[PDB]
């Protein structure tokens, strides 16, 4: 293949096969859902077990202001760098009209900066997938960017490794999130995330992360401490 | 070669030149890191070139602050920006803040250092190439000892025992058994002497490796002498 | 060979290979058809989603550039939000220079002149999107076609995407002399909803927009009851 | 005022096919005489001799660039510059300084080796020129020295007449100013030869 | 040393592949223009064919407005001559605020091929494919009288006059026609319904299909109106039945 | 300084004194401040000798490259706005008062350009600080069509009612005339200040100058 | 964005590149110059593509300022890019030292843009070489100039297309004491011994320089002078 | 693109810059001219292209500023070249403005080895950045200063920089310098010195009977002093003799020819 080595490259059957590299960078990252409720979003996170002794810890989910949180999945720079942009321009925002961004312009502004970066001969495709969890005036949201700079707004996806499982099983309960309370769709999220991990391996606290979005709840991410009343009790029945 | 650019993507996601300078680091020297309520312990095998190098002058652990200690593996050259850079912003946010600088923060500006490479000149002028090295930082904050490690991607990543370089695998092989969560900080130390007698090709000797300590209690960094490494070894 | 790399470079034959690329990219997108009406003009399109599970609404291809302009993108979704961030930066400065709307020739022409610089460095890529700009200024109802050769054509109808020339043989069934909108609207969306495939794009959705005397000249979308079911 | 700080006077006098350049010897910070013994002329080449005036850093600073000029010229050109050509340049260096000025006003002589016409340019601090037949002169007696100049000058000189009236004009100038005198030195340049000479004045 | 043609450096016979690349990039769309002056104006003919028929014939033309008395026509890549008329405009307006005066269309054409030639010797810029006819009337000297004038700028910024031209697919066979017409009579001896019958002639000659009205584009400027105009169809039909005798 | 301009019959008479005063002073009696700018168009300045001279050397430079790029003549009004644009981007501190003068093929040009850039196109124009003394001259004796010599007769008499009423005018009038083919610049087309008086020439013998050493060099 | 160099040197010490410019250089029409004890004649070939180009319009005699003169052989567009280079060279000089710029300072400013081309990034060398006739304080100079930026000091010399013809047959024609038009005479014999059909006035160019000035020839003049010889 | 850049400041597999040894192969082909550096003065003398019959003569004044081959960089300094004669322009231009920069700042003559190394660090800057190709020139320079007096220095197209007593650059450079090694003593003169500068030219160009119309000589050596004028400023030192670059012409250069070749009948008469 020679029409995969730059970004600037058109294939002759009209693909740019670099923004395809960069979607398999992604569709190679850690598990992660977002389900999207009446009043509330909620991410599910698969972080790394530790080995058996070993804990890791890698920050995954990101909180971006008030009113909003996103989940990576990818590369965890591209990631970051993502989050201080965001960040950025929601105290920028919340500075000129003492509110928060609505969700929205601020999925037309995360494709923008996507798109900024797949055009240009000495610029690369950022190889992170993002799931934005938020709330406005307008009611819950629930976006996913991918590298092309596609935003997606959903009412429940995934994204990661082994993700189909979690996508098909969401297919069969997504139209009733718009009644499910909470802890339900908490259970549900839970329940996806579960769909992706290994065949050995149960999902627990030491490998889960919970982000929740709502009307009178600022994003609040839920992990080993606080993480005990969702998780302790949970187990997947076929 | 330059047949791909320094940003292109692999096939299989991964940027090219992040993953060649992956595997400048297993290239490189064996480096320690173990993390207990007592404290954090960083072991480096020196590799001297000759019996004629000043042990000292190739110091593997560099003091980041009085509490935070860093150890690479890979490219020594390219490690003392990193440690530069480290040393600069730790003794920016004790001038702003007026209190030392978290271990996870220090970490953070390493690798925004770190990522700061490509080939498009326009306003700033990147590096050409992703640093060829790894970095183990050790330190004791208001969250007690930390151990954090730099990848060449620029992603950090907190950990309780790791091991960069050459002898990486087999260290965590040792890692899995002979390590708990509650290690006195004496075992912790046997431990990584043990491994690094397990991952060297040498012979070891008191001035053949470098081990440092930042002790919960007191806070600060301590420099092990030879002495008082053959007095690790003498137990 | 090396001929076809980057759009800097002419063939043996006077042709640019990349920007054929990016129309073969624009070629093989969701169908999108456009009729100008004498009275304004009507865009529709067909979003393929492949998922069951997005929020009604997610991935617009119509957005407004100014109060009485529009695009609606065949292609690559955010080259065409950069185009259309393009437009309404062309279309504020006339407002804000000029404190005029802009008419939709000019709009059309700076459309065509943006895309086109992106196939004359080798730095840069063409767009993989063609633009279908739909206007209701001072010059009456006005409808263009920006290719991402940057060539800029006006329509009376005009259909592109994959299911290209069935759609543009259903458009020339029409009169667009005694057509109105109000028709057209139902016309686009039925020519959309026959030509497309029920076996390959198993989720797929019209958007339909217009801009006429009947919403005060403003582009915005139809009302939800409006477009036929099927 | 800056001009006047550091004192001196020039002054070119055209004779037939000469003329006597003449500078005074006083360099002072303002009114206390730091050096009686500093003309201020400077040999471009055998055919032009100029002398520079006003503040002494700026006089230095720009006889430097001159100089740099100069032989830059006549390394890219394998000749000696002209006259009129040295005093073009000059009105374009002081005039790309023409809002921050350098404080010299230069007097400039020369003649053409084999023709003998003889031509005298002194231009402002901006470079504004000024090119007549009998004579030039700046400095802080710049007055007395055109009065005793339109007082002494004939148009047919030869170089020793010229010389005198050259001599006189300057001491009786220099006796009237008090930045200026303690003796003169002035360079009769002609076709053929260059002499220099140095003139007793009062050590007042 | 292996590719030598796919930048602007020169072959070992010592010419340049990318502009010559860019001059077959002008006869690729199929278009033909003509243009030709008369003793008192300038006309320029242009192929406006539109085979499809849902496409507003009014709205694509290949004839521009440099300035008020200079006009333009513009043959080949379409996109890329358009750009070119853009810079053109610039070069007419700073000149305009230069110097006061309405620029001249000789040095509009040389300035047009000063650009040109950058594009041809810069190595990641691609020539323009189009050739490039400004028509428009001169200001003489020492009488005061306009005279008609026609200037063609190449891709490889050549910059020339002419009493009469042709561009585009099968220019060669306009070109011939016109020389074997000029061989007999004298152009700029000519009235300008006269030209405007030898230019239709040789267009359709070069074609061989009797061009109707609706298939051409007619721009002009006279001596009694400098200002560059289109001839209604009316003027071409007339002309064209003219020309059928 | 005093300069004038005047269209007549068929062309432009312009006119100026020859006194450089150096601040109260009287540096050169014959100072030239009628400048050439083109074949057909001269420009006489008033105000800082420097900034005029720069500035006409400067403009009458792209002038000629003009030329040399179209191949035309050039024409006044081009002049005219290379030198208001240039004069305006300064904001009057390049101080020249400008007088230009030419004829093209629109017929003869006369205009005045002030040190601020603003321009003013008159049959008769005056400037420098004895201009309103020359104005009142033209405004009593200018009429429509003169000849040449009526035009230089007038243009000759405003500029010696500057070199009589002001004191920074004087001692020549400066005279061109400007036409379709040919431009004349006469010098002493008037001299009302001849030489009275002459000289003693008083004889000052070679030696009576004492010197203190003397350097000869042969060339 | 092309800020790399496009000429390099070969494994034979080769600049391959300046070598093809130089080759590009010897395509074009044939032109010469003559120099003569009281001045210098430049004479090109003006050899329209059709009877329809308006012979008036193009140009390949250049005047560079009132006293130097121009042509060249080659590429007419890389040509001109020079030849203002050279007009805006020469009005600089009259502006900083209100004198005409001497011929040998011009011919080196003009060489050093050919070595910046030669030697910079993202740009090729250029395919033209220059004949430039002119008046100094020193007398008349007629130089060369090639693609690679080296410059000659010439009696009579030609460039373009049969040029080693022409530069032969000036060879035995040229005199030492030659006189102006006689030196004008042997120009218009050696632009007709190469000549494919009839000189006329629309066909040719000339300039001579003469003792002030290069005063391009009008088309009487050259009629004065094609039916004499 | 990047595909089309030919990399020229980057290192080879041996360690070796491959435009700077192509530079230096060009050098190679270009006319040889030689350097000998004596006590009482320093000559070059080079081998110059065969004189066309319609070459034209430059009719500069100040004949001893710049020949054919031979250029004058400052009154105290000389430079001979061999390579691409337009690169050699634009160094000479840029080591007069160095030299003349010098002067303005100390007004002092600058050092010739100072003058060397700042014109060297021109050219390696070629060979380690901006992407382009380096300058294919390498330079003689001869000139006289106070702390070394006479010195003669050769530079190579990658930045260094040499001094020699005799030198040579171009065409059969290894010949001349095995010839130079043969005949040069300390005790020698400048009129020997010349001597042992055109017998070694011409046999390296392989002529018997050398031609006056191929071959060019310059000289640096001290001269007494002409333009001394104390009275214009009296505390200023002026030397007695200063240093003079002068070409020799036509006829200068025939007497010191004819010694040569009858020097080399005189030395190849008794081989027998």
């Known amino acids: 293949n020679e029409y995969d080595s730059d970004i600037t490259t058109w294939s002759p059957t009209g693909r740019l096969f670099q923004i395809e590299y960069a979607n398999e960078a992604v569709n190679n990252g850690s598990a992660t859902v977002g389900v999207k409720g009446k009043n509330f979003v909620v991410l599910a996170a698969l972080k790394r077990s530790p080995v058996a002794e070993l804990s890791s810890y890698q920050e995954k989910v990101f909180e971006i202001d008030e009113h909003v949180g996103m989940s990576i999945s990818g590369l965890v720079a591209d990631g970051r760098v993502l989050a201080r942009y965001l960040r950025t321009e929601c105290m920028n925002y919340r500075y000129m009209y003492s509110n928060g961004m609505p969700m929205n312009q601020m999925a037309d502004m995360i494709g923008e900066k996507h798109q900024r970066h797949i055009q240009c001969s000495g610029k690369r495709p950022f190889g992170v997938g993002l799931l934005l969890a938020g709330y406005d005036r307008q009611g819950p949201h629930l976006y996913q960017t991918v590298p092309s700079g596609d935003v997606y707004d959903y009412k429940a996806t995934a994204m990661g490794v082994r993700s189909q499982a979690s996508r098909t099983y969401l297919e069969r309960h997504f139209e ?56 302790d009790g949970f187990k997947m029945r076929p | 070669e330059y047949d791909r650019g320094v940003n292109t993507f692999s096939p299989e996601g991964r940027i090219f030149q992040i993953e060649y300078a992956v595997e400048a680091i297993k290239l490189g020297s064996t480096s320690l890191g173990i993390r207990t309520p007592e404290g954090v312990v960083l072991a480096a095998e020196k590799r001297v070139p000759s019996t004629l190098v000043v042990p000292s002058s190739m110091s593997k652990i560099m003091e980041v602050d009085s509490h935070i200690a860093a150890v690479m593996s890979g490219m020594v050259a390219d490690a003392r920006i990193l440690v530069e850079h480290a040393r600069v912003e730790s003794q920016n946010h004790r001038f702003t803040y007026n209190e030392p600088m978290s271990v996870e923060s220090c970490t953070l500006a390493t690798c925004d250092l770190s990522i700061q490479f490509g080939e498009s000149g326009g306003r700033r002028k990147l590096m050409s190439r992703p640093f060829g090295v790894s970095l183990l930082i050790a330190g004791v904050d208001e969250k ?80 092990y002498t030879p002495t008082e490494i053959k007095a690790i070894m003498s137990r | 060979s090396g001929h076809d790399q980057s759009t800097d470079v002419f063939s043996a034959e006077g042709r640019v290979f990349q920007v054929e690329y990016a129309g073969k990219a624009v070629d093989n997108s969701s169908t999108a058809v456009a009729a100008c009406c004498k009275d304004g003009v009507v865009v529709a399109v067909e979003k393929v989603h492949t998922s069951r599970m997005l929020e009604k609404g997610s991935n617009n291809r119509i957005h407004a550039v100014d109060r009485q302009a529009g695009i609606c993108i065949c292609g690559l979704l955010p080259d065409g939000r950069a185009i259309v961030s393009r437009a309404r930066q062309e279309a504020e400065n006339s407002r804000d220079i000029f404190a005029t709307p802009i008419r939709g020739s000019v709009l059309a022409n700076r459309v065509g002149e943006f895309m086109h610089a992106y196939t004359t460095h080798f730095a840069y890529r063409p767009f993989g999107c063609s633009a279908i700009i739909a206007s209701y200024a001072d010059d009456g109802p006005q409808l263009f076609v920006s290719d991402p050769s940057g060539t800029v054509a006006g329509y009376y109808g005009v259909a592109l995407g994959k299911a290209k020339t069935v759609a543009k043989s259903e458009l020339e069934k029409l009169d667009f002399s005694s057509l109105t909108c109000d028709e057209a609207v139902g016309k686009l969306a039925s020519i959309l909803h026959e030509v497309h495939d029920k076996q390959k794009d198993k989720l797929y959705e019209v958007e339909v927009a217009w801009v006429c005397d009947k919403s005060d000249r403003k582009f915005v979308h139809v009302p939800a009851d409006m477009v036929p079911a099927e | 005022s800056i001009m006047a700080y550091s004192g001196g006077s020039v002054m070119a006098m055209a004779g037939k096919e000469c003329f006597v350049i003449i500078s005074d010897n006083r360099l002072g910070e303002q009114l206390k005489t730091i050096s009686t013994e500093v003309p201020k002329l400077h040999v471009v080449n055998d055919s032009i001799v100029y002398g520079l005036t006003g503040l002494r850093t700026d006089q230095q600073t720009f006889a430097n660039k001159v100089q740099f000029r100069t032989e830059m010229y006549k390394l890219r050109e394998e000749r000696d510059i002209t006259g009129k050509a040295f005093a073009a340049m000059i009105t374009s260096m002081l005039y790309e300084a023409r809002f921050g000025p350098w404080f010299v006003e230069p007097v400039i002589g020369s003649i053409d080796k084999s023709t003998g016409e003889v031509y005298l340019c002194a231009t402002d601090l901006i470079g504004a020129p000024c090119e007549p037949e009998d004579y030039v002169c700046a400095g802080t007696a710049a007055e007395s020295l055109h009065g005793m100049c339109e007082a002494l000058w004939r148009p047919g000189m030869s170089p020793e007449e010229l010389f005198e009236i050259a001599a006189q004009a300057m001491l009786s100038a220099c006796d009237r100013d008090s930045l200026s005198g303690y003796g003169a030195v002035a360079m009769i340049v002609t076709k053929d030869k260059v002499t220099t000479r140095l003139i007793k004045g009062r050590k007042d | 040393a292996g590719f030598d043609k796919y930048i602007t450096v020169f072959s070992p016979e010592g010419s340049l592949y990318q502009v010559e690349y860019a001059f077959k990039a002008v006869t690729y769309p199929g278009l033909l223009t003509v243009a030709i002056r008369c003793k008192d104006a300038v006309l320029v003919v242009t192929q406006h064919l539109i085979p499809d028929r849902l496409m507003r014939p009014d709205s694509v033309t290949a004839l521009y407005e440099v300035t008020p008395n200079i006009g333009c026509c513009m043959t080949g890549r379409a996109p890329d001559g358009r750009a070119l008329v853009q810079r053109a405009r610039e070069e007419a307006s700073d000149y305009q605020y230069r110097y006061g005066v309405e620029i001249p269309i000789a040095v509009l054409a040389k300035r047009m091929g000063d650009k040109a030639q950058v594009r041809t010797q810069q190595a990641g810029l691609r020539p323009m494919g189009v050739v490039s006819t400004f028509i428009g009337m001169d200001q003489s000297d020492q009488d005061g009288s306009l005279k008609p004038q026609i200037y063609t700028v190449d891709p490889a910024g050549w910059t020339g006059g002419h009493i009469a031209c042709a561009a585009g697919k099968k220019q060669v066979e306009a070109m011939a026609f016109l020389e074997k017409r000029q061989k007999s009579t004298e152009l700029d001896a000519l009235t300008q319904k006269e030209a405007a019958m030898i230019a239709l002639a040789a267009l359709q000659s070069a074609i061989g299909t009797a061009v109707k009205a609706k298939e051409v584009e007619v721009g002009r400027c006279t001596a009694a109106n400098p200002a560059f105009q289109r001839v209604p169809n009316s003027e071409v039909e007339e002309w064209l039945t003219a020309v059928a005798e | 300084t005093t300069i004038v301009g005047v269209v007549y019959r068929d062309g432009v008479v312009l006119g100026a004194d020859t006194r450089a005063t150096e601040g109260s002073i009287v540096a050169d009696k014959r100072c030239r401040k009628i400048h050439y700018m083109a074949p057909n168009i001269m420009c006489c300045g008033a105000g800082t000798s420097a900034d005029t001279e720069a500035v006409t050397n400067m403009v009458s430079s792209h002038l000629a490259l003009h030329r040399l790029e179209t191949g035309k003549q050039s024409r006044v009004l081009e002049a005219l706005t290379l030198l208001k644009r240039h004069l305006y981007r300064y904001q009057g501190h390049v101080s020249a008062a400008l007088v230009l003068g030419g004829v093209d093929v629109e017929g003869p040009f006369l205009a005045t350009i002030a040190p601020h850039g603003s321009t003013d196109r008159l049959p008769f124009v005056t400037m420098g600080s004895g201009s309103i003394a020359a104005m009142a001259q033209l405004e009593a004796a200018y009429k429509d069509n003169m000849t040449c010599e009526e035009a230089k007769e007038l243009v000759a008499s405003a500029i010696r009612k500057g070199i009589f009423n002001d004191p920074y005018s004087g001692t020549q009038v400066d005279v061109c005339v400007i036409t379709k083919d040919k431009t004349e610049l006469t010098i002493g087309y008037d001299k009302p200040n001849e030489r009275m008086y002459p000289r003693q020439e008083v004889l000052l013998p070679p030696g009576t100058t004492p010197v203190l050493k003397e350097e000869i060099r042969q060339l | 964005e092309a800020f790399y160099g496009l000429t390099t040197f070969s494994p034979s010490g080769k600049l391959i590149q300046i070598e093809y410019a130089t080759t590009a250089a010897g395509k074009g029409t044939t032109a010469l110059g003559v120099k003569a004890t009281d001045g210098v004649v430049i004479a090109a070939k003006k050899k329209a593509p059709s009877t329809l180009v308006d012979a008036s319009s193009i140009q390949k005699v250049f005047v560079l300022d009132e006293h130097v003169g121009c042509t060249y052989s080659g590429m007419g567009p890389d040509c001109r890019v020079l030849i203002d280079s050279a007009r805006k060279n020469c009005q600089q000089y009259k502006l900083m030292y209100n004198e005409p710029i001497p011929i040998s300072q011009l011919v080196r400013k003009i060489s050093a843009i050919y070595q910046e081309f030669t030697q910079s990034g993202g740009v090729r060398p250029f395919g033209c070489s220059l004949l430039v006739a002119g008046v100094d304080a020193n007398g008349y100079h007629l130089y060369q100039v090639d693609p690679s930026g080296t410059f000659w000091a010439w009696k009579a010399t030609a460039i373009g297309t049969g040029s080693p013809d022409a530069k032969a047959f000036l060879e035995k024609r040229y005199t030492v004491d030659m006189e102006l038009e006689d030196a004008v005479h042997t120009a218009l014999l050696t632009l007709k011994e190469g000549f494919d059909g009839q000189m006329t006035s629309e066909n040719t160019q000339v300039g001579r320089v003469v003792e002030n000035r290069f005063e391009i020839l009008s088309v009487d003049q050259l009629r004065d002078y094609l039916d004499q010889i | 693109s990047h595909r089309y850049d030919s990399r020229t400041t980057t290192f080879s597999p041996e360690g070796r810059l491959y435009q700077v040894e192509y530079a230096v192969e060009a050098i190679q082909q270009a006319g040889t001219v030689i350097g000998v550096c004596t006590k009482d003065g320093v000559v070059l003398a080079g081998e110059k292209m065969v004189p066309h019959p319609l070459f034209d003569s430059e ?107 005799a030198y040579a650059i171009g065409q059969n450079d290894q010949v001349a310098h095995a010839l130079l090694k043969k005949d040069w003593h300390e005790s020698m003169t400048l009129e020997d010195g010349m001597l042992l500068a055109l017998r070694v030219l011409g046999k390296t160009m392989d002529t018997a009977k050398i031609d006056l119309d191929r071959v060019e000589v310059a000289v640096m050596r001290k001269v007494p002093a002409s333009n001394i004028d104390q009275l214009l400023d009296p505390f200023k030192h002026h030397p007695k003799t200063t240093p003079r670059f002068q070409i020799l012409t036509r006829s200068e250069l025939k007497p010191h020819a004819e010694r040569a070749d009858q020097a080399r009948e005189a030395e190849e008469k008794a081989e027998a």
């Open chain 1, 176 to 231: 009733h999130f718009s009644d499910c309370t909470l802890d339900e769709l908490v259970t549900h999220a839970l329940k996806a995330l579960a769909s992706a991990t290994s065949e050995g391996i149960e999902l627990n606290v030491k490998n889960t992360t919970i982000a929740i979005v709502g009307k009178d709840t600022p994003f609040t991410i839920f992990e080993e401490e606080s993480a005990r009343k969702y998780l």
């Open chain 2, 144 to 223: 007690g000892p930390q151990l954090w490690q730099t990848d060449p991607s620029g992603t950090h990543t907190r950990y309780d025992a790791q091991a960069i370089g050459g002898g990486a695998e087999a260290a965590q092989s040792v890692f899995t058994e002979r390590y708990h969560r509650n290690m006195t900080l004496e075992e912790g130390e046997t431990l990584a002497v043990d491994i690094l007698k397990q991952v060297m090709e040498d012979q070891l000797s008191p001035e053949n490796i470098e081990v440092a300590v930042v002790r919960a209690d007191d806070g600060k960094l301590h420099m």
């Open chain 8, 59 to 165: 009719s500069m004044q100040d004949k001893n500023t710049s020949g054919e081959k031979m250029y004058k960089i400052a009154e105290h300094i000389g430079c001979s070249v061999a390579g691409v004669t337009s690169d050699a322009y634009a160094l000479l231009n840029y080591a007069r403005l160095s030299a003349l920069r010098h002067q303005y700042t100390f007004q002092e003559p600058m050092a010739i080895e100072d003058l060397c190394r700042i014109l060297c660090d021109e050219k390696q800057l070629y060979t380690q950045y901006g992407g382009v190709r380096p300058y294919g020139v390498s330079f003689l320079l001869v000139g006289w200063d106070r702390y070394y007096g006479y010195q003669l220095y050769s530079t190579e197209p990658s930045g260094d920089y040499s001094a020699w007593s």
